[PDB]
């Protein structure tokens, strides 16, 4: 139902210790990246936000993170979900700490929100008060700055992004041009904390508006 | 049933009246693009043809047009369908006109055609007599030239494209290499309107022959 | 159930006897490529392996080979499956011979293997003892050299690739970064035949290990959160 939180779920977690040189090469790891933390989940944007949080909570970098084509509901296997993330660190301890922070964030109450009665339209409007090393790299903004992470289905996202950009003094840093692998769209916007918040609120309101009147 | 038209459906339409400068930047709009028209639908190629038709009826440009992975039947949300299109124009009135032309075309009787009994194989064989500014650009030909717009599932499309190219005096302008986002394939072919129609007819016949005999290669 | 072979199926096969120049150009064919063989199936990596077998059996090259987004289970049409392959040769006879070998290989008993009770996790751990021209070119090795062709879902594949690389004297030739179109991942590894077999064995064991315990981390390391 409308305004319900869609609960995100982690599906698998594993660790690689003393990563093989052949794999380190293909993943373009740094010399000091000895251990990898692997995670899959059924919600990509929540997991991306969680991985970024992990770079704050632990001595890890996000070295790989990709979404699956057509989304979790179309997964052909049990553990694929719609996202794979890989953290890299100097030791299993740091990688485990990163994965724990990732899990904590995923389970913290964050998630996509339903915009209609049968949850067939959903959106993500998450304000990140200070970016870690992953989302700042991705957005092309300074580490530690705030951002609004805004995602919705393609038309809703374009309409609502326009509403968000007019609601506050924010800049569009990275555009998730539709379709993402999961057939969504969105952007990372940056500005002051209060501006980003204002953008998240306007975005959510605008998605709900389209959902209530798709053909008007 | 074979030869049945598969009706295309529009799912969502909205107008942005005064696009924000930030959005205008990431969409790489031109300064004269003040208003956007957004549309999604459950059939990508019909929509692309419709959008191109809109550029003939109004002063709008197709500034964005993309298909969704795995097609409308696999959409995870209500309004995603399998295509999003964005028209840009100088005013909301002009964008509204372009959207109305787009909608009219989508509901004009064009569409994919079934090749078999349960409609599990379908194809698009549409002759565009006079391209607008969108398809001409993507095909790399002058505006106002004719196209055969040919789409089918991957093998059917490769086989039928060969038949189309042999049936008529046409050239391949743009190859939709399998898979497109929707797991189809095909091409835009150009030539005279009559040659394009002949290519459409041959493509159609060839897709149907594969559907009736999918494993036969001897 | 676990260790069950997943049977691959061919969906469509055709020959273009005399390819048009317009198509030859877009496919970037060689002048001597006069005929095309087309095939679709519901399992991409088995079909790729089969196409490579074709190049050992007849005068054909693999000139096109691509997987479908989100895999065969999400196909929206009857013949799309999850793969299209195109062979090119100098004549219809050679293409027919190539397609024949392709079909035979697909129906030989090769296939993905299930890792759990409901076959919701599967993998491919195929030792190609003698590569044809397609896989050897893909891997950047000489024809006839051995390959381990390893594929599994994304996390399983990353974990199991690391296991495979450590279990034998092999080199990573090609990495299929997750997601491939079908939302899998894997690699082609090369080495001696025995080394490739060891890699295949280690890969299979590692995937089954993840399948049986995908979230062991929670109890071991995530307690008191
Ligand atoms: Na599906």
Swiss-Prot record, chain C:
Please provide the record's keywords in A-Z order.
Bacterial microcompartment, Cobalamin, Cobalt, Disulfide bond, Metal-binding
Q: Which InterPro entries match?
A: BMC_CP, BMC_dom, CcmK-like_sf, EutL, EutL_PduB
Annotated compartments:
Bacterial microcompartment
Q: Which residues form a coiled coil?
A: none
Q: Which SMART domains match?
A: BMC
PROSITE patterns listed in its UniProt record:
BMC_CP
NCBIfam families, A to Z = microcomp_EutL, PRK15405.1
Protein name as it appears in the record: Bacterial microcompartment shell protein EutL
- Per the record, the gene is eutL
């Amino acid at each position: 139902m409308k305004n319900d939180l869609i609960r995100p779920n982690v599906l698998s977690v594993k660790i690689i210790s003393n990563v093989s040189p052949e794999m380190a090469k293909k993943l373009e790891l740094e010399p000091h990246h000895k251990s990898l933390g692997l995670i899959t989940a059924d919600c990509d944007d929540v997991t991306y936000t969680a991985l970024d949080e992990a770079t704050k909570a632990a001595e890890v970098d996000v070295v790989y993170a990709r979404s699956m084509y057509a989304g979790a509901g179309n997964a052909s296997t049990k553990l694929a979900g719609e996202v794979i993330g890989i953290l890299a660190g100097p030791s299993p301890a740091e990688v485990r700490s990163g994965l724990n922070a990732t899990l904590d964030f995923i389970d913290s109450g964050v998630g996509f929100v339903s915009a209609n009665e049968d949850d067939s339209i959903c959106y993500y409007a998450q304000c990140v008060s200070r970016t870690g090393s992953y989302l700042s790299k991705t957005a092309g903004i300074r580490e530690g700055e705030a951002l609004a992470y805004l995602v919705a289905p393609p038309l809703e996202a374009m309409y609502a992004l326009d509403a968000a950009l007019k609601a506050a003094d924010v800049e569009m840093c990275e555009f998730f041009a539709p379709p993402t692998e999961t057939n969504f769209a969105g952007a990372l916007l940056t500005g002051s904390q209060s501006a980003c918040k204002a953008a998240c609120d306007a975005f959510a309101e605008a998605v709900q508006s389209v959902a209530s009147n798709p053909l008007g």
